Structure formats: C-alpha cells, structure tokens
Design an enzyme around this catalytic site. Structure first.
Site, PDB file in Angstrom:
ATOM      1  N   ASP A 111      -8.489  -2.707   9.955  1.00 46.31           N
ATOM      2  CA  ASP A 111      -9.548  -2.947   9.002  1.00 46.31           C
ATOM      3  C   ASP A 111      -9.079  -2.091   7.847  1.00 46.31           C
ATOM      4  O   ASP A 111      -8.624  -0.975   8.055  1.00 46.31           O
ATOM      5  CB  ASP A 111     -10.881  -2.469   9.554  1.00 46.31           C
TER       6      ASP A 111
ATOM      7  N   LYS B 154       0.604  -3.134   9.174  1.00 51.04           N
ATOM      8  CA  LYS B 154       1.563  -2.055   9.293  1.00 51.04           C
ATOM      9  C   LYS B 154       2.652  -2.464  10.258  1.00 51.04           C
ATOM     10  O   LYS B 154       2.426  -2.625  11.454  1.00 51.04           O
ATOM     11  CB  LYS B 154       0.844  -0.779   9.737  1.00 51.04           C
TER      12      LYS B 154
ATOM     13  N   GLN C 288       3.984   3.778  -1.457  1.00 47.06           N
ATOM     14  CA  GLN C 288       5.393   3.584  -1.749  1.00 47.06           C
ATOM     15  C   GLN C 288       6.215   3.971  -0.532  1.00 47.06           C
ATOM     16  O   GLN C 288       6.912   4.988  -0.554  1.00 47.06           O
ATOM     17  CB  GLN C 288       5.803   4.461  -2.930  1.00 47.06           C
ATOM     18  N   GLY C 289       6.123   3.167   0.527  1.00 45.59           N
ATOM     19  CA  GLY C 289       6.872   3.441   1.745  1.00 45.59           C
ATOM     20  C   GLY C 289       8.228   2.758   1.732  1.00 45.59           C
ATOM     21  O   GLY C 289       9.057   3.047   0.874  1.00 45.59           O
TER      22      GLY C 289
ATOM     23  N   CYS D 255      -9.097   0.269   4.538  1.00 52.45           N
ATOM     24  CA  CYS D 255      -9.879   1.345   3.939  1.00 52.45           C
ATOM     25  C   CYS D 255      -9.252   1.556   2.568  1.00 52.45           C
ATOM     26  O   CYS D 255      -8.032   1.717   2.436  1.00 52.45           O
ATOM     27  CB  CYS D 255      -9.769   2.619   4.761  1.00 52.45           C
TER      28      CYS D 255
ATOM     29  N   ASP E 237      -0.993  14.640  13.771  1.00 55.79           N
ATOM     30  CA  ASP E 237      -0.463  14.349  12.446  1.00 55.79           C
ATOM     31  C   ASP E 237      -1.591  14.465  11.443  1.00 55.79           C
ATOM     32  O   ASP E 237      -1.718  13.662  10.522  1.00 55.79           O
ATOM     33  CB  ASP E 237       0.177  12.955  12.402  1.00 55.79           C
TER      34      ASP E 237
ATOM     35  N   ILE F 137       0.875  -1.153   0.000  1.00 57.32           N
ATOM     36  CA  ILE F 137       0.000   0.000   0.000  1.00 57.32           C
ATOM     37  C   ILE F 137       0.920   1.212   0.000  1.00 57.32           C
ATOM     38  O   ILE F 137       1.707   1.412   0.927  1.00 57.32           O
ATOM     39  CB  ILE F 137      -0.902   0.009   1.246  1.00 57.32           C
TER      40      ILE F 137
END
Ligand code: ZN
Ligand code: ZN
Lengths: 49, 329, 247
Positions: free
Chosen positions: B89, B41, B20-21, B91, B134, B18
């Site tokens: 969950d 994550k 481009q980290g 999104c 944030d 998900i």
C-alpha cells in the site's frame, strides 16, 4: 520419528541425521533405524528405479 | 506454466520512480481497475548463487505475518513473465524527507502522535517476535491521511523469547551505523527488541534536531559519539559490559559524562520529551526503556496531548512559490 | 478461500494436474511418497531439521495440486523444495551442498560432474529456476503449520506415556510421507488422527475430562470421534497399500 519440542524457534531445532549409519539389514530393529530405513525397508517405498 | 497465485505486475500501471535507487527498484503505481495506489519493490538479485535471497524470503514471511495499522502493508507478490515484486500500500512520505524539509512544521502535539504510532508499531512487531534491524528516519513512512507505518523489513528476522536456556547467536552487523545501539558496536550477538528502541530514540531526537544526531564515520567513530553524548561506556552504568571481547580491543574514551539532555536542551525544550529520549538512549540494553513503558510515559499523557498530523501535512506544499511566498497582501 | 486455498475436496484431489496428463491416481500417490522419501533422505544427509523436511514435503504436496508430475519430475522438484525449505526454516544449506547430496542419492554410481563443467553450472541454474517456479506456484505462502506441533502439545497435556508420545509424533511424519492429509485437513485435525491411531495400537482410552470434553476437544473444536475413526480407517488403508504390503 523422534519427538522435537515444538516451542523451539526453527533455528534451534536439532538436525535430523541419524546418530548412526544406515545398515542394509532388514529386521524389526534395522527397519526402524530412522524415518528413511522405515519408509524404504519396512514399507518398501523408494525414489530410484 | 500455470501460476494462479502470483499475478503479473501488468495489472498495475507504473506511474513514477520512488526515490533515487537503482534502475527499476521502487515504483509508485496504481491498480488498473480500482486505482489503488501502491509501491512496487523489486526483489534485487544481482548476487545470484544461493538462489532466491534468504533475506527476501525473511522479509516476505515477516510481511505476511505482520498486520497492523502502524506496519507497512504487503498486498501481494507479483511477477513479470524475470523479476519478482513485493506490492505495498503506498505511503506518500518518509520521515527522513519530512524532517530534512525544514519548511515543514511539527507541533509538539504532532510529534507526540508520530512517536506514539512508531512505538505502537514497535510493540506489535516485538510482540510477534520480530526485530526490525534497520530503524532510521527513512524507514518510517507517513501516509497522506496521517498514519505512520514502519517500513522496509528487508533486514528483519525473528527472535526467540528465551529467558530460559541457551544464548542466541544472531547476525551482529545490523542496523545503519548512525542508528546502531552500543551493544551491537560491541559485538553482541544475543540482542533483542532493545536495538530497535535505541533507533526509536535516535529518531525521536531528530524530530527536533531535523537531522541524525550521531553521524559516525566508522564503527569506532560511532562509539566515540555515543560516549560523547550518552556517557563513557563503563561497567558502572552497564554491568558486565566488561565481558565483551571488543570491550578491550577498542579505543574507548573513559571520562565522558552523560550529556543527553543538555545537548538536546536547546532543541527539545519540553521536559517529558527530554526524559523519554533520555530513557531511550540508555547504553545498557537491559536498562533501556521498552515500547510498552515508553507508550505510558508522561510525554504521551500530558498537555499538549497527541493530535492528528493534519497541520504538519498542510505545511508540506506543492512548489517553490507556495513555500517561499508570504501569506498576505 | 485464502485460508481455504490449499485444502481440497476428495473430488479435486482426484482431478489433479497430473491426472489431466494421464497419470493414474495411485501412481500420483506413489510419486508423492517417493518425493517425500527423497526429501527425507537428502534432508538427513544434509542434517537439516525434521521441521525443514516436513515443510519441504508440504511445499511438494501443494506444488503438485497445481503442476503435474509429468512436466515436473518429483526427483527434480525435491532438491529445490528442500533448498527453499532449509532457507525458510532458518537452517540454509549452500546450493552446492544440496546439489551434491541430491546427486549422491539419485546417482550413487556416477560421480559428481566437474563443478566447473557446463553440465554442472547448468543444473545449479536449473535448481535456482525450479526454486522460483515453486515459489510462484505456492503464491509465496511459506509459513507452514505441521501436525507435530499439536501432537506434542496434546501428549504433554494428557500425560501420554513416552512411548505413545513418540508413536504419535512418528505417525504425524508418516502422515506427511504417505498421505495427502496435509492437503485436506488442518494440522490440528491431522494431529488428532495421529494420536487416535497411536491410542488404538496401545489400546489406551484417554479419560474424558471431568463431566465434559473428550481429549481431542483440547486440540481442535471441529473434530468428532466419527471423523477420527474414518480418517484412521483411511490412514490404515493407505499403509496397507504400500509396496511391502502387497545383526
Ligand atoms: Zn536409518
Ligand atoms: Zn538388523
């Protein structure tokens, strides 16, 4: 051993360190100097060997 | 080593990355048995010294506390027999992406619903004594079903409801520059829910402008643009702003007049919408509108009324030809 | 069961992980009490709040309903739980600070290994490692409710004497240190036990609110006097089983 106001946010809580050093004396008073002195002197509990 | 309460991420099947980290930072995945769509994550720990990041512990604790329709839902925390993963969950969209894609259309009514959910989410977290810290369009998710979720509490912390005694001294360098309220740029360490509403104001503007309205290059530059748009920062509109240490030691334009509504005029149009943005982008935090009043502002109670996001979601398409092809013969 | 996950029947407390490894019941209980004393000792050294030490003790008690004192010496786990707790209760102490204090406590004689030595860097790692195992063992449930909170609220509510207020608070701490009540009864109930006990030692009989409920009904709705007498009897037996009770 000393009541702390619960409503204080965690970071506002006072340190637990006793105001004075822990003597090696054993008497109704020195045995209740702090939680550590009470647990070790008056109750004879200890983590070491 | 027995570990009955932290399952292996193996139970999910990774489907795709998900964004481009980093290598394996965020993954879209599905529960192998229920098919439940989730986002994994990874707790990043490149910097290892103080052990598990207090920042991660805060996020986890806050995520476990906050349970509300407009806040991201943490399902569990898994492990890979080593990494740790926060499972959420899933999104489908983030607001930053929906707004950048100018092909997607937002009706005034849908914008209302978007801001309503966002403000309801902020009410909830502030009520529970949490500051997000944030805020930004990318941290506002919208599900396929049209429900908005405040996300990424990776920099959130709890605050004290102290009208009473001593001054709180919270971390000052917080919030992305483009969304940072004036008080923080000025050194404030005893801040509260208002820093998040400033962000809700910046985001609201973007619902029309389609891109961040104040893109400062530096803190000094960020302050410049805020003065340029909101009006010079003086003790006249912000009583006692004088006391800030940095109030002096900082280049600060003095003749600026508040141009909030004029500059957004062309973009927004609807007066109620411009009024709310105007109240959200108030320099002095004590005078900035809060989530509760913002929710009861005429904007949300005047025609056209809040509507679901089915329409806006239909303008999000499946590829080039659908986006670019005319609708006819 | 998610709210019931960390509460155990007298039977389960019996069939503990350590038990399955030939650790005798009373032996396990001393281990817990020894771990708590260490946590309290390092805690005061570091000057972390009592809230930090209390949370660390619960982390410890829960850890050991899953892992065995065999595989994880209380003296290893303690440093780690406390490091984690200080972070969680927003009063973090650097990892080196904790490692120092821990060494001073467990090795008053020897001296700190060179912060450059292999051995040192080694433990700094083992602490980090342990921390992760604790987090995973606890299923990452970090928020803890302590009796102390309900105790003060109750004593203020009944206008207890400053002395009864302090004794009650003091007993809440001892309940974490000496008993496993934190693994059996909810903090509100434990708070009631600590007050009930304090009230007996001061022969004070909190008046029943005008044609109605008893004082403990203002702390927990499930508590019965029957329960308070029992748990109080139990807390007293445990106190009678500690080492020294056998200027
Ligand atoms: Zn002492
Ligand atoms: Zn003495």
């Amino acid at each position: 051993m000393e009541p702390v106001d619960p409503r204080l946010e965690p970071w506002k809580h006072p340190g637990s360190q006793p105001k004075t050093a822990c003597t090696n004396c054993y008497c109704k008073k020195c045995c209740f100097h702090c939680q550590v002195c009470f647990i070790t002197k008056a109750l004879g509990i200890s983590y070491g060997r | 080593v027995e570990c009955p309460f932290c399952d292996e991420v193996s139970k999910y099947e990774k489907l795709a990355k998900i964004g481009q980290g980093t290598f394996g930072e965020v993954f879209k995945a599905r529960h192998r048995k229920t098919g439940q769509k989730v986002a994994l994550k990874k707790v990043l720990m490149e910097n290892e010294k103080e052990g598990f990041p207090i920042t991660a512990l805060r996020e986890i604790k806050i995520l476990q506390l906050l349970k509300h329709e407009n806040v991201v839902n943490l399902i569990e925390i898994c492990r890979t027999k080593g990494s740790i993963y926060l499972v959420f969950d899933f999104c489908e969209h983030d607001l930053a992406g929906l707004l950048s894609n100018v092909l997607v259309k937002f009706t005034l009514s849908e914008i209302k619903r978007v801001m309503q959910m966002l403000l309801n989410g902020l009410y909830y977290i502030h009520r529970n004594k949490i500051l997000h810290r944030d805020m930004k369009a990318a941290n506002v998710l919208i599900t396929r079903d049209g429900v908005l979720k405040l996300a990424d509490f990776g920099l959130a912390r709890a605050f004290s409801l102290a009208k009473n005694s001593q001054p709180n001294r919270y971390t000052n360098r917080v919030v992305t520059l483009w969304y940072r309220p004036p008080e923080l740029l000025l050194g404030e360490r005893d801040y509260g829910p208002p820093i998040d509403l400033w962000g809700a104001g910046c985001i609201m503007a973007e619902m029309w402008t389609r891109s961040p309205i104040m893109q400062g290059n530096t803190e000094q530059h960020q302050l410049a643009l805020i003065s340029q748009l909101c009006g010079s920062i003086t003790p006249e509109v912000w009583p006692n702003v004088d006391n800030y240490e940095l109030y002096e030691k900082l280049e600060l334009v003095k003749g600026q007049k508040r141009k909030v509504k004029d500059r957004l005029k062309a973009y927004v149009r609807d007066p109620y919408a411009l009024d709310l943005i105007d109240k959200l982008l108030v320099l002095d935090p004590a005078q900035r509108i809060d989530s509760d009043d913002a929710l009861n502002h005429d904007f949300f109670w005047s025609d056209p009324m809040p509507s679901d996001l089915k329409g806006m979601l239909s303008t999000h398409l499946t590829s080039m030809f659908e986006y670019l092809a005319p609708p006819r013969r | 069961n998610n709210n019931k996950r960390w509460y155990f029947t007298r039977e389960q407390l019996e069939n503990s992980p350590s038990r399955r490894f030939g650790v005798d019941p009373d032996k396990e209980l001393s281990y817990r009490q020894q771990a708590a004393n260490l946590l309290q000792d390092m805690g005061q050294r570091l000057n972390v709040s009592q809230l930090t030490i209390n949370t660390a003790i619960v982390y410890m008690h829960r850890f050991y309903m899953i892992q065995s004192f065999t595989q994880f010496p209380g003296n290893s786990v303690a440093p780690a739980a406390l490091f984690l707790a200080a972070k969680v209760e927003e009063q973090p102490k650097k990892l080196e600070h904790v490692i120092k204090v821990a060494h001073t406590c467990l090795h008053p004689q020897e001296s700190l290994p060179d912060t450059r030595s292999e051995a040192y860097l080694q433990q700094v790692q083992d602490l980090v490692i342990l921390e992760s195992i604790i987090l995973q063992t606890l299923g990452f449930e970090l928020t803890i409710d302590h009796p102390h909170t309900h105790v003060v609220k109750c004593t203020q509510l009944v206008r207890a004497s400053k002395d009864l207020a302090q004794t009650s608070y003091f007993m809440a701490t001892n309940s974490l240190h000496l008993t496993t009540f934190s693994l059996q009864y909810t903090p509100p109930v434990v708070a009631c036990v600590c007050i009930h006990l304090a009230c007996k030692w001061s022969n004070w009989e909190i008046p029943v609110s005008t044609d109605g409920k008893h004082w403990w009904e203002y702390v927990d709705a499930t508590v019965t006097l029957e329960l308070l007498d029992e748990l109080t009897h139990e807390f007293l037996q445990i106190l009678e089983k500690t080492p020294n009770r056998l200027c």
